[PDB]
DNA sequence: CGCATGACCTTTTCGG
DNA sequence: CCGAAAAGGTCATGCG
């Protein structure tokens, strides 16, 4: 009882996956016809052993997310020759992203000084890193579909993306054009507090938090560039194009609403410094862990080296 | 009817 | 040789 697809009985692997002979079948023919079909529904339908002949375009698309292989299907010069050859979202993504943030018309000035005038200050920037850590997490299995991936794909997924969030995050909602850079939890420090924990890092932060904000991004955008940092193709996934699929969802998701109220980009056209912003992160992480004076926590130390393959 | 379905067939290769 | 694995081939059956 090992069908990948429907559940039905599987003895053997067809195209790459463990699957019944009718789930074989069907995506045999599907690729040998480039047939194309019809969700009468969300793109969810139920395929389990009974329920699977109905929603056809949702029975294929199970069938290419559990890891089937167009590919595998022969065609040309190898066309009928058998046996073994020679070698809605949008509103979930604000959703998810408003109650992880804070009231910004309740915010904490309580340690707040424009002019600041040590072991202490760079444990509090350790203790800001792993209080975002929850929070992200708890963001991200909002995304509709992320908490329907194997844990260790969730796990993956969040390790690759958690500091190339939290800096995105950290620019959008904080405000550069006065220093001043605003947490999850609410606390509020100005860049020259920083410093003593983040390094220079930290004026690249907010050089990027300009540049940001001064594009005057709505937040159904945001929302969507956020999902689309997260949930990317990455080594190891052991579902990919269930990944690639949920990806293609929150882009065209995006799309819908530019050609919508913004009429018919220059943001990932800075995904890049995004990247090399995140670099910059990890180059200070090196630089704590070798002075051996205050060590980042294995947990910063290993989610710092992660945002590389 | 004409067409999808799926149980069961034959074909190919490998390695002991 | 001959079995294991996994490609396409062959229809009888069910559907609308
Ligand atoms: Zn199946
Ligand atoms: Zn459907």
Redesign the pocket.
């Known amino acids: 009882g090992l069908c990948a697809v429907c559940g039905d009985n599987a003895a053997?692997?067809?195209?790459g996956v463990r699957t019944?002979?009718?789930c074989k079948?069907?995506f045999?023919?599907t690729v040998q016809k480039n047939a194309k079909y019809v969700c009468l529904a969300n793109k969810n339908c139920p395929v389990d052993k009974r329920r699977?002949?109905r929603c056809?375009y949702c029975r294929f698309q199970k069938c290419l997310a559990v890891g089937m292989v167009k590919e595998?299907?022969?065609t040309d010069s190898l066309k009928?020759?058998?046996?073994?050859?020679?070698?809605s979202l949008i509103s979930a993504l604000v959703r998810a992203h408003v109650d992880s943030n804070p009231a910004m018309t309740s915010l904490d000035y309580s340690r707040f000084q424009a002019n600041p005038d040590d072991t202490q200050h760079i444990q509090q920037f350790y203790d800001l890193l792993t209080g975002s850590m929850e929070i992200i997490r708890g963001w991200a299995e909002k995304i509709p579909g992320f908490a329907d991936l194997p844990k260790a794909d969730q796990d993956l997924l969040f390790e690759s993306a958690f500091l190339e969030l939290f800096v995105l995050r950290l620019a959008y909602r904080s405000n550069p054009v006065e220093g001043k850079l605003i947490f999850c939890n609410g606390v509020v420090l100005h860049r020259l507090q920083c410093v003593r924990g983040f390094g220079e890092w930290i004026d690249s932060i907010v050089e990027f938090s300009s540049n940001l904000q001064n594009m005057n991004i709505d937040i159904s955008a945001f929302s969507c560039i956020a999902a689309l940092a997260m949930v990317t193709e990455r080594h190891g996934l052991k579902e990919p194009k269930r990944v690639e699929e949920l990806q293609n969802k929150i882009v065209n998701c995006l799309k819908d609403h530019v050609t919508f109220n913004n009429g018919g980009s220059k943001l990932l056209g800075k995904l890049p410094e995004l990247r090399t912003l995140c670099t910059q992160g990890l180059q200070r992480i090196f630089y704590l862990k070798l002075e051996d004076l205050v060590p980042p926590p294995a947990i910063i130390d290993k989610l710092f080296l992660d945002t590389l393959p």
């Open positions: 053997c692997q067809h195209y019944c002979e009718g079948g069907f045999k023919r699977r002949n056809q595998v299907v022969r009928g020759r058998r046996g073994r050859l020679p070698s």
